[PDB]
Design a protein around this ligand. Sequence first.
Ligand SMILES: *[C@@H]1O[C@H](CO)[C@@H](O[C@@H]2O[C@H](CO)[C@@H](O[C@@H]3O[C@H](CO[C@H]4O[C@H](CO)[C@@H](O)[C@H](O)C4O)[C@@H](O)[C@H](O[C@H]4O[C@H](CO)[C@@H](O)[C@H](O)[C@@H]4O)[C@@H]3O)[C@H](O)[C@H]2NC(C)=O)[C@H](O)[C@H]1NC(C)=O
Ligand SMILES: CC(C)CCC[C@@H](C)[C@H]1CC[C@H]2[C@@H]3CC=C4C[C@@H](O)CC[C@]4(C)[C@H]3CC[C@]12C
Ligand SMILES: *[C@@H]1O[C@H](CO)[C@@H](O)[C@H](O)[C@H]1NC(C)=O
Ligand SMILES: *[C@@H]1O[C@H](CO)[C@@H](O)[C@H](O)[C@H]1NC(C)=O
Lengths: 218, 227, 219, 238, 184, 184, 211
Amino acid sequence: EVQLLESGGGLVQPGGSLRLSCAASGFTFSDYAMNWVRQAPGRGLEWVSSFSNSGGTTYYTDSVKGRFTISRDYSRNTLYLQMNNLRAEDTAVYYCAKALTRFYGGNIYNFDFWGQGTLVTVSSASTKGPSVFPLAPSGTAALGCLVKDYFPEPVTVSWNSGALTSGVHTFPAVLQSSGLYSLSSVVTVPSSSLGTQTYICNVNHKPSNTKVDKKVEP
Amino acid sequence: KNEELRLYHHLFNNYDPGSRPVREPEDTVTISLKVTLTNLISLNEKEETLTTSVWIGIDWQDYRLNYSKDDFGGIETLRVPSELVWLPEIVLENNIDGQFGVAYDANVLVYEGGSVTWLPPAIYRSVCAVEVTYFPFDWQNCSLIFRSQTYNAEEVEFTFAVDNDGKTINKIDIDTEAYTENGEWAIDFCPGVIRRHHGGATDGPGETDVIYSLIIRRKPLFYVINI
Amino acid sequence: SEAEGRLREKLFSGYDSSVRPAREVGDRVRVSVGLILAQLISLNEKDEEMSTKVYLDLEWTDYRLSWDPAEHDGIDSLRITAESVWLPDVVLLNNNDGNFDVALDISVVVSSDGSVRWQPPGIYRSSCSIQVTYFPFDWQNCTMVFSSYSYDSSEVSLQTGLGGHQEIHIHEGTFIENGQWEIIHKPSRLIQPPGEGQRQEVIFYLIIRRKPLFYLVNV
Amino acid sequence: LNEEERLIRHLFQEKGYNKELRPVAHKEESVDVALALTLSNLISLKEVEETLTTNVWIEHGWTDNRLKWNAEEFGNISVLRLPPDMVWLPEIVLENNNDGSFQISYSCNVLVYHYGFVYWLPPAIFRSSCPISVTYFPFDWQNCSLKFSSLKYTAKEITLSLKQDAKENRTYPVEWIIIDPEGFTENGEWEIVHRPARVNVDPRAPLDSPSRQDITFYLIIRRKPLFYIINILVPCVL
Amino acid sequence: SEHETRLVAKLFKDYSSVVRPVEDHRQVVEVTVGLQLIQLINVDEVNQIVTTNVRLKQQWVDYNLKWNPDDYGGVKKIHIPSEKIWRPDLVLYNNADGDFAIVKFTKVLLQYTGHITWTPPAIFKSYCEIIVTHFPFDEQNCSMKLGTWTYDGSVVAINPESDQPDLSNFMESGEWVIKESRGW
Amino acid sequence: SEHETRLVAKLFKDYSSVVRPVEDHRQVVEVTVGLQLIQLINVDEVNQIVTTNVRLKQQWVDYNLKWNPDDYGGVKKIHIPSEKIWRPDLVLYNNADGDFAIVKFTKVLLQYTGHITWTPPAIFKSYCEIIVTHFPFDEQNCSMKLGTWTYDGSVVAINPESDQPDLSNFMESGEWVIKESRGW
Amino acid sequence: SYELTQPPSVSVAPGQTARITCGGNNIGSKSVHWYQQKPGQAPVLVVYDNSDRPSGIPERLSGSNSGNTATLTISGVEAGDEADYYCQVWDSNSDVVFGGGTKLTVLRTVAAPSVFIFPPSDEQLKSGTASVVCLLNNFYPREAKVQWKVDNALQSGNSQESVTEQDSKDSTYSLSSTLTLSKADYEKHKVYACEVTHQGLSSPVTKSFNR
Ligand SMILES: *[C@@H]1O[C@H](CO)[C@@H](O[C@@H]2O[C@H](CO)[C@@H](O[C@@H]3O[C@H](CO[C@H]4O[C@H](CO)[C@@H](O)[C@H](O)C4O)[C@@H](O)[C@H](O[C@H]4O[C@H](CO)[C@@H](O)[C@H](O)[C@@H]4O)[C@@H]3O)[C@H](O)[C@H]2NC(C)=O)[C@H](O)[C@H]1NC(C)=O
Ligand SMILES: CC(C)CCC[C@@H](C)[C@H]1CC[C@H]2[C@@H]3CC=C4C[C@@H](O)CC[C@]4(C)[C@H]3CC[C@]12C
Ligand SMILES: *[C@@H]1O[C@H](CO)[C@@H](O)[C@H](O)[C@H]1NC(C)=O
Ligand SMILES: *[C@@H]1O[C@H](CO)[C@@H](O)[C@H](O)[C@H]1NC(C)=O
């Protein structure tokens, strides 16, 4: 079972450093070239770096040459990306991707498997946890929670400890003029169930380690 | 589409060969053992070394490799490389040349119901102290001592395999039709015994092994005629 | 080494060391085969085997491993570990001990035109049928038959190494002379298949005369 | 050991160490490799096989400037123990073996000092060709050699030299095989008379040939003939 | 090269060397087995072992290793490492003190139809009943039993390539003469 | 056992087998070394080489390989491949012509406290000065000098497990009698 | 700078066939690979070498390559094919080159929004701000406008809109408009509403409340 778990992403100031790691399992780590491909928020895919065991070669795109270093752990099946002198242009979700070939390059070169990635945010702004505000309802009713004043992304919203999945809509975060992110997570239910069934929103903000859970009732 | 591939992905996508197949740590894995001798190559008296060719039948249960033939197109057996499954790591403890393991890492057979069978062949060079007193009219008692290199008796235990009638095979098995007697050595007896020891409170964890005793007889004709 | 690292990155891009270099289907890889005899270790008459220490001298072209020195800091040659590049599967067919391969893979030398030169060491035990009639006043004819194990004549074509001298090379100063054998002739020959699964051979012949002083004194 | 963990991360993951490349600023430079040989024990000299079996510890010293660090930035660490296959190595081999065992036996750790010096003391069992002069047997003496060179690298890429020792702020080359006076057990049949070491450069060879350079450690050994005297010669003569 | 590099990359994408190489598990892998005897190395009478130098030609069809040559520049055959693919696990059943299975993993010749020919070498050390009654005028009859160790006939079928072993490249022995040879 | 799988994944998530396994680098790794003599295989008087079969018990604490059993279903001990972890590089300094270090990399027993016991087997071939003056009535004192090859005492410290080698599982020798044995 | 060129958006009705093009100079001589990225998910290789399909990918996705254009064809468009499709090649001088991804949109039938309005709670009012959120649930098409009215006065420069992607089961849209004001401003006026304009509604629909 091929599996690529990325870690080490997070918040860093401009000009700082950060080591991304990608733990690989389910395949012979030395038989496939490994790659880092980044995606800035709302933008397309951009190849960053590649490591090939064929000749022990490393390859970098021009914008990161001299700043980024791709390497592999000597013993464990772990791929590293050491990033230095980070700019605001490096903010992105970094995916660790396995190639079809042990060598880098050639026309056949493609990424047959991808990890879920890690978000890297480059900004001088500090961390802050969310402030939850329930959206109280005033023949189907709608309810929700308003996550506000948090930074950096993301905040994960669940309902009733994961029991409620049907009809949930968690909106994209929006950047305020204050520089802080906010989103609303809502669910539509029959109006008859407002008084009988309990609806609780669980907001989790990993960057600040916040787990505020708020009950919603009229 | 080959149903063998689907069965393989079903069984081995989430499987750890490093962990024993026990639901709890205190449970013990029972290993059914048979040892089949194909050839007695030699007994070097100068080096006190018995060279034999055998293959060891090892059967056990892995609940993690449990499957029904009806759900996979009637497959009753799957061959896979032995490195992919947990093994009890049986070794010949009394080897003289430093070779503890088997000669060829054959595929394991995974049957329906979680039954795992491994039948690897081996060439063993084992210690046999030669009682010299009546040489060349001598008989020897060469031991073959098998044990888990890793696990104690509470983690892995041994039982003897049973024949078709259910009689316990507490001996070295020899196929009579395919067996050629050694030019100088006749095998008179070959009982096996499962020993357990070091189970005391001070010792702590119990230990177990299986000892086969090849009672072999020299044929002294060469020494009679020539010397 | 930054220039050498950049050149290695360029050369290893898209390169499969397990794939034979043929730019077009039907192209044959010309492999020049030569031999340097470092030591004639022995000729065991009981086991009928000649033990030798040699350096092969294999030369071919891999078009994928070519570059322009003007764009790579004037680098005209590289030394690359042999496992990293495609090798012809050239082995001693008439080995006596089951050992087909070289003793140490070492490194190939790659020129900017794609020429690859490889000189691996090898300790070889080759089958030699012994002409026993005039022993110990005998001379033997021990061959070393080198050929690709897998590739046929339509894929890899062999030729005798030369620069043309068709002979085993023996360096006069550094050669470890044998105390029992004198090398009379040491030619090499390309053997064609009998006129598609057919394979050429390069045979190095050692015609050696025993020096029988021991048997004169002792027998 | 958080400090050397951080140091290894800084050396190999931050700076991007490539062990395939030699430690040189430019390709035309040559890596100086200092060699010394310690004889742990002379195992045997088989006359019929014409083979010398020896146990030797080969001291390699070279400089890898990529593996430099400031000690006070890393907990005052001054030395690291790294796997030999984690860093470029000057692959020296025994050229004149006669069994196919070119390489050292135990690939031990390299020691890397903060000022970039790499020290490596692999031990090895070596079986080398020693042609035997039988003229004066059993009163014979032999002249065996251990010829060390590199087949992966030529004189253009590495320069071989003898180890240099110091006494009273005076440097001198180590031009002999090193033998511990206390720990060395003499062979039961062979006494070492001379044990020189030499850097040999062939002027005729091209610089890009592996045969251009070598370091040879010679053993001049005299047979102790007491066994042959007592058991063969006195009975035969009488 | 480029065509073959692309072909070799694409052939082994979802390839599994664990399962048998058949479209349907109810099929049988038909293997043709032919022994070539290069040399009779030794007949050890005391330990009853015959050492021989052999080539064990094995031919079968891998269903999933097929391609159309027109899509790959006309490449019709390739050579690939044998360790990457499923192989039959032929074992010398009466091995005395040598190797039980093939240990020299030479390249396999793969055709576009999926036909694999694999011709590894081996040193067979086989246990043979040695009758020394008429020594030195003794005749022997030493056999080499070969079989798939872990696969039964219902999943892998082995068939002889020829009624006799291939002695075309046999080196003449200075101590033995092969009067008869045959595979059953 | 899924608990053991999760535990092994946790322990080796960011583990290094290169770094010495204690919290601060100024600390010394304390290793307990014990020798068990299984068999005295042979004494070669000509080449002065004693061949023996031994077990080299090595005990040490790995600081980072600790866990709470309650968090992992009561798992108190596991078996880990020795290649995956840091080990002391014990070498037989007076090796004659055998292996210098351990080549049989058996599994280590790792307790939840970080304690590791590793008991690899080895065939030691040691150089022993043979005094032949009183042969065949001779007495021979042969040593086995063990030490960490690349680590000095300031980074790795070795201590004897016992004053004497363990001879409890010693096989009887048909040529020699061990009158006295001791470690220093 | 090989510069693979892709169209930003491709729209097709359910059951029809979508053709996502990737243009390049002599791209027919190159091997083109196609990746699918669902919203908030890792990319998945769906085609490699211009026509080959990885195992587990539906046969209704295919590829072609010719001249100066490669094509990905998605037939039988379901409600779960909404994704960004990226073409990719490798060049000796440009290394790995991705295309500017193409979003696939399902052209389903018109469905009108379900409108709700939510005034701020006392919990937010204790903090000194007022956020009025009004929600347009499960509508199509995406073109809709929300206008905030406070005592018959339109708001401007103090509202934020957030739009979801097409749902994987019904390919509908959801939108949220949040009007944020200081508490003094919120107390300064009484009636607060939002008006929803959407082509599926015969006339604009207002949801209003009194504080
Ligand atoms: C060929 O070799 C095999 C293997 O060596 C022989 O079989 C073994 O023979 C030995 C004896 O030579 C025998 O050892 C005896 O074990 C029993 C059982 O031990 C258990 O129980 C006792 C208590 O009952 C505990 O003390 C012990 O901890 C334990 O687990 C002992 O009782 C017995 O003791 C008796 O004999 C001793 C001398 O041998 C004597 O000192 C003592 O006072 C007492 O009278 C032995 O120690 C093995 O168990 C046999 N089996 C195995 C599997 O090894 C076989 O006999 C040999 N064949 C020939 C023809 O010689
Ligand atoms: C008749 C008597 C002398 C017996 C015959 C002796 C013969 C065999 C001679 C030939 C060479 C001699 C040896 C040559 C050199 C030396 C000198 C010194 O190191 C002690 C004696 C010793 C070692 C000699 C011992 C006797 C010797 C062995
Ligand atoms: C395997 O699964 C079947 C079906 O649940 C069950 O009946 C059987 O007992 C199981 N046996 C094991 C654990 O091998
Ligand atoms: C290293 O030693 C110096 C003195 O030479 C001292 O000033 C410094 O603090 C030491 N560093 C550490 C980390 O101990």
